[PDB]
């Protein structure tokens, strides 16, 4: 299966090691993926069922 960015649905090149969230580029990681509340990641991953 193709890996997509969990935030925007773009092509997900990377994946953050802490919250296990795929992201597209550096700006998305610095803005959304890294400074996010706990429990937001578990429902981001609920879309593709990886919780």
């Amino acid at each position: 299966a193709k890996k997509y960015c969990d935030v925007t649905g773009l092509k997900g090149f990377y994946k953050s090691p802490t919250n296990n969230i795929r992201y597209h580029n550096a700006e998305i990681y610095q803005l959304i993926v890294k400074p996010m509340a706990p429990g937001v990641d578990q429902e981001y991953l609920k879309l593709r069922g990886a919780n």
Binding site: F13, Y14, K15, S16, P17, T18, N25, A26, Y29, Q30
Partner: protein, 436 residues
């Protein structure tokens, strides 16, 4: 980058010219020879326009008067990614190459092919490396946590990338660059961590950067030749590359130019001391300047109505009249006392030698009375006399001591002529006995 401290032409940083191709009296380490510098700027613009090929330029004049300096100024003002082959006259007399083949290789080393291509690189600092192995090691799992200053990511590695990471051992904290296609992993060093040293990369991890290549026609000639590989560019045993390979390379380059895949970058082939070639080499130069993929050839000589090599007659500049028909000649002139003084000041400040006014005047006097290069060589050898008596500034008597210690041409010729029995003549007659 490619450091070497002091050379003979190291002070020259290019032709000193303004926007209107007019020479300043003192600029970029070049003084004097205003018409010669203006003509060399015109030739430099001929190279920079790149629409005109196969033009012969002859630089002629007295010895030690701004000939190789002009070529070094042209090469310095040319800029990089433009080829500048600087060969000598005696360099083409090979034992495994013919003279025409060596001349063809020197001609085709000066025409570049400009190719721009895009590549994918992954550069960042390694956080953690986690390979799980089996007993036989056939199947392995991998986890590579890598980061830049802006990003953090974790990668699952295949068996080939795990093998390529154990080979060329990467630990935590190393900064590495990864090419995903070829699999080459280059260790750039370690990150800034006390518990060689390279700064951590910033920005994106998966980067798309454009690299720019300039490959000469001789390199494609060697690679396309099936007899010898690309290592002949370094070993030098190319060995008479056939003309069909040359024609195929010319047709393929003309194909790439029309489709926009490549660009033609013509350069300069500088044949220093061109009087050492034979008439066969001169006629090959005559017929090699009428080709599309021919550089602008600069030839330098100091001979005046000399015997042409391989012939039995006398020709101007040592070159036959058909070669002089195809060449436009730049003439260099002798220097006055002010130009010699300025050259000596530039050469003294290049070698970090502090000169007094009286020592500079003495050097100028013995430069206008013996030779310019003699006074240029006296500066560095009188500075050692200056520091041998614990003195910084070179005084007049240091130059006088260097003058009496080291002889020029005229004093040595006079001392030889006064003591002709002590030396071996043309007939091999010498006298070693000091008695009788």
């Amino acid at each position: 980058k490619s450091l070497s401290l002091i050379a003979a032409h190291s002070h020259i940083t290019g032709l000193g010219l303004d926007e209107n191709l007019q020479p300043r009296p003192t600029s970029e380490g070049m003084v004097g020879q205003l018409q010669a510098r203006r003509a060399a700027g015109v030739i430099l613009k001929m190279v920079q326009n790149g629409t005109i090929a196969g033009r012969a330029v002859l630089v002629a004049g007295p010895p030690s008067t701004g000939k190789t300096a002009l070529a070094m100024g042209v090469s310095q003002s040319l800029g990089k990614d433009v080829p500048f082959t600087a060969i000598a006259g005696s360099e083409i007399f090979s034992l495994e190459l013919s003279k025409t083949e060596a001349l063809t290789q020197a001609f085709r080393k000066s025409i570049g092919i400009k190719i721009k291509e895009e590549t994918e690189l992954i550069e960042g600092e390694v956080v953690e490396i986690q390979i799980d192995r089996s007993i036989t090691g056939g199947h392995k799992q991998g986890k590579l946590t890598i980061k830049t200053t802006d990003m953090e990511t974790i990668y699952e590695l295949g068996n080939k990338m795990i093998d390529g990471l154990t080979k060329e051992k990467v630990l935590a904290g190393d900064v590495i660059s990864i090419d995903k296609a070829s699999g080459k992993i280059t260790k750039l060093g370690r990150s800034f961590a006390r518990s060689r040293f390279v700064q951590c990369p910033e920005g994106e991890l998966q980067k798309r950067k454009t690299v720019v290549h300039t490959v000469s026609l001789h390199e494609i000639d060697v690679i396309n030749s099936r007899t010898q590989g690309f290592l002949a560019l370094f070993t030098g045993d190319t060995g008479e590359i056939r003309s069909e390979v040359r024609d195929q390379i010319n047709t393929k380059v003309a194909e790439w130019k029309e489709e926009g895949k490549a660009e033609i970058v013509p350069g300069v082939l500088f044949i220093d001391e061109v009087h050492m070639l034979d008439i066969e080499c001169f006629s090959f130069i005559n017929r090699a300047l009428e080709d599309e993929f021919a550089p602008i050839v600069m030839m330098a000589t100091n001979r005046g109505v000399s015997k042409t090599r391989g012939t039995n007659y006398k020709s101007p500049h040592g070159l036959p009249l058909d070669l002089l028909d195809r060449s436009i000649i730049i003439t260099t002139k002798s220097y006055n006392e002010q130009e010699i003084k300025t050259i000596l000041s530039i050469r003294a400040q290049e070698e970090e030698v502090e000169l007094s006014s009286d020592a500079l005047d003495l050097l100028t006097k013995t430069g206008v009375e013996t030779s310019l290069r003699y006074s240029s060589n006296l500066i560095s050898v009188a500075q050692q006399i200056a520091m041998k008596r614990k003195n910084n500034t070179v005084e007049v008597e240091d130059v006088k001591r260097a003058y009496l210690l080291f002889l020029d041409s005229a004093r040595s010729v006079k001392y030889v002529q006064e003591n002709e029995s002590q030396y071996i003549d043309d007939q091999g007659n010498v006298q070693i006995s000091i008695a009788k």
